[PDB]
């Protein structure tokens, strides 16, 4: 007797930390102080959860971790993957939200931004398996995680994405996947691995956890040899146009799943055809909104501060249909693209823009009730 | 050599730290990143300076410090005033920007916010002295600062005020000045008086400097005895309606000085006649805007975030004329009131609102050059 038959799992994006893993003073990811998504939907009789997965890691690593967060158990990235990229095979161990998750017992998945790519990858592994792992365990025996087997169906009812960079973002390509910024991010991760740190930024599999008796000097020296510094097995790569197109090229539609996208615009056309961020765009996205909005290709300009619209609407090589706000969003197997939220930047989707008074709590509450209602109607039309 | 014959001294208000007295990471007071007032005006040929005076102290302690900042020497707050409020007589010693300042060598005074009040009190001391010190020195001998003796004129060419609370602000009466908030400010002052601190928040004359060999516990006990905790000789008091009316009542017009005010509004009328902050009001003033905006007296409602329009246009019941932006602002002895700058909040005057992209550097630049233009007019017409 929750009102939804299937548990709802909200999956954060690229930078986010949740629950026990957030620093001392740090915004609440799912709703900021505008609408406490988890707490308020629960007060309403819904069974909902926020996943906690790697903040800086690849979609791959995140999809595996999402699997273990739902099922419970010790993260297994796969032998073949671990050896090819140069990081640990085994990771955190999760309590598990639905230990009985299996064909027939389903979950709804909602992902903000990179969360939406993560969800699509995890589901691809459940349905189709991972060819490199099946081959290797056949070549080398031992174990293979049931995440990599293939043949798992009827496990996810829905995949809904909010401001997801399905075709990547120039803010990754031109900033950020660049070498200087990857170093900044990896240095942060090294520092947050220190022996006084209680928080996990998601790259401990590459060596970034200082041992209780290791000096910080020996720590620096050891971790400067990790392959993280030059690998593509990280978020910044995956959020690039190439990195996201690679994910599109190996995913496909499950005809049994309900697909739906939401997209925000927070830029406006300037006298030359370029896009500039609206007053109101959370200010940390000002430069990235300009870089996107000055693209040479006109259709790659309109953006939500960090993801252009042509990237959020749907993966470019996958089937989609434009839907009105009033249509039940209840077609299976095709991306149902919601009308664009005017004025919503990338973080207004999760209510942490505490400086934008145009975007209020009661608006954000209607937006999330609206998604639960669509999910209730997936349940009813099955 | 300089294009202005008389030096310009800019004087910061209540919370302001400038120059080498600002923390490692901290906005530049005079112009933010939008228009670097001191540096650009020097490039363009003007002789200008940024005074450095107590950030938390009374207009009285600040006016004394302004005089020594200009003239040079060791700050003497006056024996009668030290004995009456229970703080040290002698404070910091300044090098002096114009060691030769005396009748005949004038200076232009430009005050932001509380700086406007500080500057009127200083002029008042030059012309009329300070009667309690004159009386004290008469009765007890000793020495008396020449700041307190009176009869020093032709030292100030102009007084210009930006968003100065000439008539006080309800943001002081109702918050900040309240007990709970003075404790906060005094605790910050105690903290930054610690023996590792290189920044002076302007209350060390009340005992807030930890000795090199004094423990933190001892420092706490010693200073918990200071009168600062219950005194009115501080900024929060002086910014209230009563504390600014006390200063109005002891000041008078000087018929040789050119007086000019600017004022901003950043609030808009609600359907009940109340004022709420516009979007773009620097966010830290949203609450103080609402407090001012919801006053019982309608003419006290319009505001710049923290100062009501009525407090900023001119001291009440001192003579004033409304002036245009075009006409010469060259009248003597009379507050010239500049038209209210629409959309400018209290901190847009000094360009530190890095969140508000409506207020451009080119605009802030034009605004300060227009002040300098006026000051050149003052010089040309004397
Ligand atoms: C100048 C005073 C500022 C206070 C204005 C009331 C604003 C309410 C907002 C509450 C949260 C902000 C302060 C908490 C500090 C923090 O979270 O780091
Ligand atoms: C927001 C604070 C930024 C401080 C900059 C220091 C950067 C140095 C790289 C540090 C690497 C490490 O400590 O492991
Ligand atoms: C944003 C930092 C505020 C932290 C709260 C500490 C308040 C304690 C009062 C401190 C007094 C002192 O340190 O002398
Ligand atoms: C950065 C804070 C400065 C404190 C230095 C003063 C040292 C004296 C210690 C008194 C004992 C205590 O600190 O609790
Ligand atoms: C001293 C605390 C530092 C925490 C860094 C958080 C970065 C992130 O949000 O992913
Ligand atoms: C630990 C850093 C303290 C900064 C004090 C800032 C107060 C002020 O602006 O007057
Ligand atoms: C540093 C604060 C991060 C908030 C989460 C996000 O921006 O997606
Ligand atoms: C801390 C707020 C004090 C408000 C008075 C003013 O700045 O004009
Ligand atoms: Ca916004
Ligand atoms: Ca502003």
Numbering used by the authors:
A (entry chain B), B (entry chain A): 4 to 385
Give the authors' words.
SA lipase (SAL, also known as glycerol ester hydrolase), a triacylglycerol esterase, shows strong cytopathic activity in host cells. SAL, an ester bond-hydrolyzing enzyme, is secreted in prepolypeptide form containing 690 amino acid residues and is processed into its mature form containing 394 amino acid residues. Its active site is composed of a typical catalytic triad including Ser116, Asp 307, and His349 residues, similar to other serine hydrolases. The SAL crystal structure exhibited a typical α/β-hydrolase fold comprising a central twisted β-sheet flanked by α-helices on both sides.
The crystal structure of native SAL was determined using MR techniques. The Staphylococcus hyicus lipase (SHL) chain A of 2hih16, which shares 47.7% identity with that of SAL, was used as a search model using the CCP4 Phaser program. Final values of the general R-factor and free R-factor up to a resolution of 2.08 Å were 21.3% and 23.5%, respectively. The dimeric refined model comprised 764 amino acids with 76 solvent molecules with 2 zinc and 2 calcium ions and 12 fatty acid fragments of various lengths. The native SAL structure was observed as an open form. In the native SAL crystal structure, dimer interactions were typically hydrophobic. Remarkably, fatty acid branches were located between the dimer interface, which should stabilize the dimeric form of SAL. In the native SAL crystal, three fatty acids were observed near the active site, whereas only one fragment was bound to S116A mutant. SAL specifically hydrolyzes triacylglycerol, and these three fatty acids may reflect a triacylglycerol position for hydrolysis. The other four long fatty acids were also found bound far from active sites on chains A and B of the SAL structure, particularly at the lid of α-helix 7 and helix 8. This also blocked the lid domain from moving forward to the active site, thereby maintaining the lid in its open form.
